[PDB]
Amino acid sequence: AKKKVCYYYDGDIGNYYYGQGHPMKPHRIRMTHNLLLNYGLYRKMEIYRPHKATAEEMTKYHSDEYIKFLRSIRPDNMSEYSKQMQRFNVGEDCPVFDGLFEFCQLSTGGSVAGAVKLNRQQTDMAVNWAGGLHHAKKSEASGFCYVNDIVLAILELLKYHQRVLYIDIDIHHGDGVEEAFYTTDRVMTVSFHKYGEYFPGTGDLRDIGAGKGKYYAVNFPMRDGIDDESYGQIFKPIISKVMEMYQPSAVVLQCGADSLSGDRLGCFNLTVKGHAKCVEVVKTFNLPLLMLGGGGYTIRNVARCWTYETAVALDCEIPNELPYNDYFEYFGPDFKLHISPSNMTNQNTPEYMEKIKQRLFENLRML
Numbered sequence: 418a419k420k421k422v423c424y425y426y427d428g429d430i431g432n433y434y435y436g437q438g439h440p441m442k443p444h445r446i447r448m449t450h451n452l453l454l455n456y457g458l459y460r461k462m463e464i465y466r467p468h469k470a471t472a473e474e475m476t477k478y479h480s481d482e483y484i485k486f487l488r489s490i491r492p493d494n495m496s497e498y499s500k501q502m503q504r505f506n507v508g509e510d511c512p513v514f515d516g517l518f519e520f521c522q523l524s525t526g527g528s529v530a531g532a533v534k535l536n537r538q539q540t541d542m543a544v545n546w547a548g549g550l551h552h553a554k555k556s557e558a559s560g561f562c563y564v565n566d567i568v569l570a571i572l573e574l575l576k577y578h579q580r581v582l583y584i585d586i587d588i589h590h591g592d593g594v595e596e597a598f599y600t601t602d603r604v605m606t607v608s609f610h611k612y613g614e615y616f617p618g619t620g621d622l623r624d625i626g627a628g629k630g631k632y633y634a635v636n637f638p639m640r641d642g643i644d645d646e647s648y649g650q651i652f653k654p655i656i657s658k659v660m661e662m663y664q665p666s667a668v669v670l671q672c673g674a675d676s677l678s679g680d681r682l683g684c685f686n687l688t689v690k691g692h693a694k695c696v697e698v699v700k701t702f703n704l705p706l707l708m709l710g711g712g713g714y715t716i717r718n719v720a721r722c723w724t725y726e727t728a729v730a731l732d733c734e735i736p737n738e739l740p741y742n743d744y745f746e747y748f749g750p751d752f753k754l755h756i757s758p759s760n761m762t763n764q765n766t767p768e769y770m771e772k773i774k775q776r777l778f779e780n781l782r783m784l
């Protein structure tokens with residue numbers, strides 16, 4: 418039926434700034450929030466402000482040294498930490514900015530808080546659009562991500578769930594999450610991503626897990642230009658089979674929006690409806706569900722996508738005509754919720770889509 422939804426947001430989020438020209442704009446989370454509030458969606462869900470996750474919380478996965486560094490590093494003391502910066506991959510893609518650690522605390526706090534809420538059976542779904550930082554590693558920043566809120570949330574869920582399923586529709590491979598759980602069967606990770614001379618360079622379909630986790634990592638490598646139809650042909654069959662074989666008791670869905678048509682950094686051709694179809698599919702399994710954000714660099718479309726996916730989680734139909742909001746000018750020239758795909762070529766033939774699906778199905782028979 419209709420599900421109870423708890424939603425995590427801290428209004429301070431939009432004030433963090435990666436620096437001039439950096440494509441990651443935390444402000445997109447405020448835009449998303451402002452938009453969904455103007456559609457009246459606050460009426461249907463509980464809105465929480467997450468706590469700032471502590472170093473204790475973060476060191477449930479990350480090394481004490483990496484976290485102490487993140488707590489210490491500031492733009493005013495960078496010159497002293499030059500070695501440590503290189504060791505932990507900070508100062509380029511992953512810059513030092515004012516309030517960096519607090520920004521990690523806020524985005525992490527939402528995922529961990531949502532996981533606790535699900536564990537206590539006090540919601541059916543928890544939403545943290547500030548989370549989904551899938552590239553962060555035990556002792557290293559990567560791809561704009563510093564602290565892996567997702568691995569932390571999953572570790573929380575594993576306190577009460579024998580098997581947790583992770584699904585990642587970000588255009589990039591979820592390497593940090595896959596890496597953390599690569600050798601366990603208690604977390605199956607499923608990533609659909611662009612593959613071939615593309616960040617982070619991992620997620621070959623032959624990467625299937627190791628030891629006890631062998632066959633519990635599933636990767637669907639894709640080419641430029643994938644569209645709603647190609648994606649839809651593959652997503653539901655794969656997830657259904659995964660659900661059948663794996664029988665998870667909780668699910669974490671990363672909804673990274675850099676897989677949308679027109680993304681500044683991505684090269685997929687999905688609409689908001691195509692992207693959201695993935696949320697609908699996962700929803701129908703009626704399992705405790707943590708939905709997280711992720712990448713997304715054309716910020717008007719990120720706001721539309723996550724607003725609509727919040728509406729999907731709520732089974733709440735919203736008009737295509739955008740309500741007035743604080744960021745109304747970002748949504749021109751159309752001022753509509755939904756987007757059109759571009760005319761870019763889909764390098765993913767139907768045959769390629771079916772062949773990869775078939776290989777993945779063979780692996781799933783091994784469960």
Ligand SMILES: Nc1ccc(-c2ccccc2)cc1NC(=O)c1ccccc1
Nearest residue numbers: 549550551560561562589616682711712
């Ligand atoms: N993939 C991803 C997911 C979440 C965050 C993220 C989400 C919230 C806060 C911080 C990072 C950042 C990324 N990084 C990229 O998308 C990317 C793009 C180009 C090159 C390298 C990486």
Ligand SMILES: [Ca+2]
Nearest residue numbers: 585587589609
């Ligand atoms: Ca992905």
Ligand code: NA
Nearest residue numbers: 598601604630
């Ligand atoms: Na695993």
Ligand SMILES: [Zn+2]
Nearest residue numbers: 587589675712
């Ligand atoms: Zn991404």
